[PDB]
Amino acid sequence: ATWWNFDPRVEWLMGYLTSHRSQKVLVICAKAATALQLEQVLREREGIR
Amino acid sequence: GPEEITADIPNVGEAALSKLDESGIVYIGAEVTGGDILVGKVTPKGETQL
Amino acid sequence: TEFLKPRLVDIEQVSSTHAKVTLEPLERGFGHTLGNALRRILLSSMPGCAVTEVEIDGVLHEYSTKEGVQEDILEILLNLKGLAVRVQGKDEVILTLNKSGIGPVTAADITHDGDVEIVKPQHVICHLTDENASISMRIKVQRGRGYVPASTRIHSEEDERPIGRLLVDACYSPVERIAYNVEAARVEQRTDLDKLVIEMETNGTIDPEEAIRRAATILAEQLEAFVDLR
Amino acid sequence: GVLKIVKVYLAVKRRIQPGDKMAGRHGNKGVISKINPIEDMPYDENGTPV
């Protein structure tokens, strides 16, 4: 279910990431499915490798 | 034996494999320039024993 | 040595675009020199704003079609190339468009920010031909001068953009047509003088007084490195 | 002998530059030689260039 479309956390993360393009960031999360879904959101919404 | 179409290509850096989905075929809309990968294929060869 | 100087005299707004600017007195042989110098530097070096990236949801590349929209997306891009905005404070803005229902979608209903002035609010963008259809877009507007295509910008930039940003060619300069004219003036006993009349046709975004002042400024600045040094 | 074949399209957009041919209907070929700023074009008595 499309839980990544109204959270504040995902929005905050994208905002932080896209203004500091010269920092390496280690994001740690809870479990595997959450990690994969975050990766998909970032890749197809802001092009952050 | 048979060929395969897959994303797990031996001896490629992770960079070129961002633009392939699970099945190993490009997205729709991604814009390519000469030299990239379109379809990931591997050809089996001889099996030596060990 | 009877040198004499010009002063900007009369401005007569024929319409919201056309405008005529008078300028006198000029001694003989100076009508043409100034006329052609600033004709050449108004058609190439004025600053203005134009649309440069468009993001429309549910669309991946610029060759598809959409549910219940008359134009296919190439036509929407070629209609957006030519809207005229006026930006007061920033140098880049993001505007938002959002509409639903049968009818033409015009430029009037861009959800205006506080400091963006849209010149003609009756310029058509799309046509919606079904009661359930809706459309929502995010435009970006920048500032610059000259002509800048999309190929140059894509090859210069190293930044990565997602699948769904569409790049548009930019055409920043606001002045469209310009033509001058030299006529004979009347001063008490000097029958030797002249007058210059420049007629100027542009969209909005430039009030003519400011245009002529910017032209004169850059000409004098160019001559400065040409007087003092040798 | 074939199992499955994929098939991928591409789409470019070409435009005018020097060297590129044009011609009228009556048989007068030609090859573009220069792309000239707006100012330099001869302009008639009213402002509109050629």
Side-chain angles (χ1 to χ4, degrees), chain C residues 45-53 85-95 115-117 140-148 153 170-174 205-206 210 214:
Chain C
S45 304
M46 298 281 80
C49 292
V51 162
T52 189
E53 293 185 3
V85 305
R86 185 188 287 180
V87 184
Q88 313 270 12
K90 277 74 69 177
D91 288 336
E92 85 165 345
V93 189
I94 294 90
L95 280 67
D115 62 347
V116 169
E117 181 88 27
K140 180 197 276 198
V141 166
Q142 306 193 2
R143 179 175 292 171
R145 81 179 192 273
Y147 175 46
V148 174
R153 196 178 28 236
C171 297
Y172 299 97
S173 72
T205 310
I206 294 295
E210 199 195 301
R214 205 179 310 281

Side-chain angles (χ1 to χ4, degrees), chain C:
Chain C
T1 308
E2 310 300 325
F3 60 91
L4 266 176
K5 293 178 173 63
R7 298 184 73 70
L8 199 151
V9 167
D10 199 71
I11 298 172
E12 192 263 9
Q13 213 85 20
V14 176
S15 173
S16 165
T17 66
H18 206 275
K20 288 182 189 176
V21 187
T22 311
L23 188 154
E24 71 179 2
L26 298 179
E27 275 198 343
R28 297 261 323 260
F30 276 93
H32 292 279
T33 300
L34 287 182
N36 200 6
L38 54 85
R39 181 179 181 271
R40 277 184 70 93
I41 65 174
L42 273 71
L43 286 148
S44 69
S45 304
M46 298 281 80
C49 292
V51 162
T52 189
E53 293 185 3
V54 181
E55 183 178 1
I56 170 169
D57 63 358
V59 166
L60 308 166
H61 48 87
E62 50 194 321
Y63 301 85
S64 59
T65 66
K66 190 168 178 175
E67 292 283 329
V69 173
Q70 185 79 39
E71 287 89 4
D72 43 348
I73 294 170
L74 272 172
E75 210 67 13
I76 293 170
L77 277 297
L78 296 205
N79 277 121
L80 286 178
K81 272 178 64 175
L83 61 83
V85 305
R86 185 188 287 180
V87 184
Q88 313 270 12
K90 277 74 69 177
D91 288 336
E92 85 165 345
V93 189
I94 294 90
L95 280 67
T96 301
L97 169 63
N98 193 307
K99 178 163 217 290
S100 309
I102 297 170
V105 172
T106 53
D109 65 359
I110 299 283
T111 66
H112 63 87
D113 293 18
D115 62 347
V116 169
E117 181 88 27
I118 287 185
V119 179
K120 61 196 311 205
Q122 64 183 357
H123 163 62
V124 70
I125 290 180
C126 288
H127 278 84
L128 284 168
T129 65
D130 184 8
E131 182 84 50
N132 305 356
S134 72
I135 189 173
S136 61
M137 312 175 38
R138 290 185 290 285
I139 298 90
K140 180 197 276 198
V141 166
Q142 306 193 2
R143 179 175 292 171
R145 81 179 192 273
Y147 175 46
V148 174
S151 174
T152 286
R153 196 178 28 236
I154 189 174
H155 295 352
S156 71
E157 181 41 82
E158 61 177 1
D159 175 66
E160 194 79 329
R161 72 185 192 275
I163 291 163
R165 295 286 202 271
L166 281 70
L167 289 174
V168 185
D169 294 336
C171 297
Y172 299 97
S173 72
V175 178
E176 286 277 325
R177 185 181 70 83
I178 185 167
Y180 66 92
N181 193 340
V182 172
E183 208 169 356
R186 188 268 183 277
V187 177
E188 298 187 357
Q189 293 82 17
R190 297 304 310 284
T191 187
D192 193 277
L193 313 185
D194 269 1
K195 72 190 287 184
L196 192 59
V197 163
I198 304 169
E199 61 186 280
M200 185 180 289
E201 177 167 358
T202 185
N203 45 356
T205 310
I206 294 295
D207 184 77
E209 163 81 19
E210 199 195 301
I212 289 172
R213 285 186 184 270
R214 205 179 310 281
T217 288
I218 74 171
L219 193 56
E221 174 208 342
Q222 280 297 338
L223 264 288
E224 182 174 89
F226 194 84
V227 175
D228 270 315
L229 180 59
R230 325 287 276 298

Side-chain angles (χ1 to χ4, degrees), chain B residues 27-33 38, chain C residues 61-64 74 154 161, chain D residues 8-15:
Chain B
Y27 285 138
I28 286 175
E31 47 196 320
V32 301
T33 61
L38 271 290
Chain C
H61 48 87
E62 50 194 321
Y63 301 85
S64 59
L74 272 172
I154 189 174
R161 72 185 192 275
Chain D
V8 185
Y9 292 144
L10 293 168
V12 193
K13 190 184 270 157
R14 299 270 173 74
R15 55 193 174 87

Side-chain angles (χ1 to χ4, degrees), chain A residues 24-41:
Chain A
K24 299 273 189 276
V25 176
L26 179 46
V27 168
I28 70 168
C29 79
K31 55 187 68 66
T34 302
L36 302 150
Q37 297 180 4
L38 276 180
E39 189 276 332
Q40 186 158 3
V41 165

